[PDB]
């Protein structure tokens, strides 16, 4: 179990950690989150009471170092930082626990929700999408754009998602024009799986990261990346059976965790109807189909 202390809470903010979140009052003595499971990635995130725009937060992994949160007044936001002085850090953590000013990562032992949400997510892949290699954790917010978005401006703040385009030379072998746009197996299996991702788990991890960024920051380009990666699979006639049964689980838990009021901006009607009812894979997403109908019948 790892801890992420907070130097202070100067401003009123709703803090999130993974799928949990708490209201913290202006200069409430709050000094961090404890009992955080080692072994997956996590994300701590923030929404100021004054600016309900720009949610923002930090992806991280306690195995990679000791991290804490300190409010910066020049920049006006909560910043993640690494303490390199091991002893100095355990010293602060132990004191604040004794003073009991920290909240406990509140995991019901039955709940695999975060693990399901994050099964394939690895920090090392995240830092290739949020290039900022002087930190071991990765910053993201509502307004950050993706690389594909930037082609169609500032590249330090780019989400460097893998670029998928159904109408590109990459996806379409000359001479198999009609074949490959109706059946994307080539693009998925050779170009993307074997070529760029190497294995299905990196693919899934990016898929799942993109979904969480959309969910937690309403990052619109992330929502786009998430749908394209679902779309590519559903639009492939030939997919490894294990990937299909893993995708069905992945989407079940993404659909299950979504806040109910946000189904309208976060779910692309066309892709979903294509995946569940039109595509090759209409029949291979049985749990995802059941949860969608019984929870969001309208969108279909």
């Amino acid at each position: 179990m790892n801890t992420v202390p907070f130097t202070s809470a100067p401003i009123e903010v709703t803090i999130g950690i993974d799928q949990y979140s708490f209201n913290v009052k202006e200069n409430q003595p709050f000094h961090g989150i404890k009992d955080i499971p080692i072994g997956h990635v996590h994300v701590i995130h923030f929404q100021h009471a004054d600016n309900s725009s720009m949610r923002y937060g930090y992806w991280f992994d306690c195995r990679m170092g000791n991290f804490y949160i300190q409010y910066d007044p020049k920049d006006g936001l909560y910043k993640m930082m690494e303490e390199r002085d091991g002893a100095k850090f355990e010293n602060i953590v132990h004191n604040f626990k004794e003073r009991q000013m920290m909240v406990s990562y509140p995991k019901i032992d039955e709940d695999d929700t975060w693990y399901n949400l994050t099964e394939f997510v690895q920090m090392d892949k995240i830092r290739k999408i949020v290039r900022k290699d002087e930190n071991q954790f990765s910053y993201v917010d509502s307004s950050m754009t993706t690389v594909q978005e930037n082609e169609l401006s500032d590249p330090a703040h780019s989400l460097n998602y893998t670029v998928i385009n159904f109408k590109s030379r990459e996806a379409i072998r000359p001479g198999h024009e009609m074949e490959d746009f109706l059946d994307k197996s080539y693009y998925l299996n050779t170009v993307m799986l074997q070529g760029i991702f190497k294995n299905s788990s990196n693919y899934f991890g990016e898929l799942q990261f993109a979904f969480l960024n959309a969910m937690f920051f309403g990052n619109y380009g992330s929502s786009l990346q998430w749908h394209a990666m679902i779309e590519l699979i559903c639009s492939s006639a030939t997919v490894p059976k294990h990937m299909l049964d893993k995708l069905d689980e992945i989407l079940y838990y993404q659909i299950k965790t979504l806040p109910e009021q946000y189904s309208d901006i976060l779910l692309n009607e066309r892709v979903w109807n294509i995946c569940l009812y039109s595509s090759f894979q209409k029949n291979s997403l049985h749990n995802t189909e059941k949860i969608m109908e019984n929870k969001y019948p309208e969108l279909l």
């Binding site: 109408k167 030379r169 379409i172 024009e177 009609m178």
Partner: protein, 237 residues
């Protein structure tokens, strides 16, 4: 973006562009079998690729052989049209290649776009106009050459004949679509109109009779009247 009555006069500026019409690509007859089930027989069809500014037509004949052993033919028709339009674009010198291709039918966009990946700077556009180029097979010489073909073949025509010698593109195109709109709504009548007077002939290298300027006015008036008469009949107005 889309092509409509706002941006109608872009058709006649000096930007090379082509219309593509796919309606006559896959043509069938429908007939009963001996067992009484329905079955279709295909006939020769054609891609209708037309430079509205100049009248150059690139009539790409589609031979029924193309379909041999193929399923989902109506879908394949769009992919072939796009395949053949691309090859036509490649066969043309760069300075003759179009800057825009306008498809008469929205279903043609993705196939054409996909087949034109190699030409990113050529824009593929839908249109909201209701153009009558499906009536291209009511033009006798055009339907003949389509019907008589034994193998895939391209035939080049000027669909304005020699009109540009005396009128502008805009007007040429308005005549062309007026005539085809009449051919579409009541073919028999429109053809009666055009051929009634046996002393006005069709030059061997032309498609329409050699009407004088005066006669073209009478014809256009009669084609107009035809078209309003058939609309009244269609809707009882």
């Amino acid at each position: 973006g889309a092509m409509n009555s706002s941006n109608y006069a872009e058709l006649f500026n000096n930007d090379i562009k082509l219309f593509v019409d796919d309606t006559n690509v896959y043509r069938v007859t429908v007939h009963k079998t001996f067992e009484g089930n329905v079955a279709t027989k295909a006939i020769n069809g054609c891609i209708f690729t037309l430079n509205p500014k100049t009248g150059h037509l690139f009539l790409k004949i589609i031979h029924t052989s193309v379909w041999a052993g193929q399923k989902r033919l109506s879908q394949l028709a769009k992919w072939k049209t796009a395949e053949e339009v691309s090859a036509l674009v490649r066969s043309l010198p760069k300075e003759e290649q179009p800057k825009q291709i306008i498809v008469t039918r929205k279903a043609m966009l993705d196939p054409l776009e996909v087949h034109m990946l190699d030409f990113p700077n050529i824009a593929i556009r839908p249109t909201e106009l209701r153009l009558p180029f499906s009536a291209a097979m009511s033009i006798d010489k055009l339907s003949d050459v389509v019907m008589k073909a034994t193998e895939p073949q391209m035939v080049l025509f000027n669909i304005y004949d020699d009109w540009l010698d005396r009128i502008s593109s805009y007007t040429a195109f308005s005549r062309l679509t007026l005539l085809l709109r009449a051919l579409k709504t009541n073919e028999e009548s429109a053809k009666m109109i055009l051929l009634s007077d046996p002393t006005i002939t069709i030059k061997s290298y032309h498609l329409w009779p050699s009407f004088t300027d005066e006669q073209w006015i009478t014809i256009e008036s009669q084609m107009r009247d035809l078209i309003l008469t058939e609309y009244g009949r269609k809707y009882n107005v």
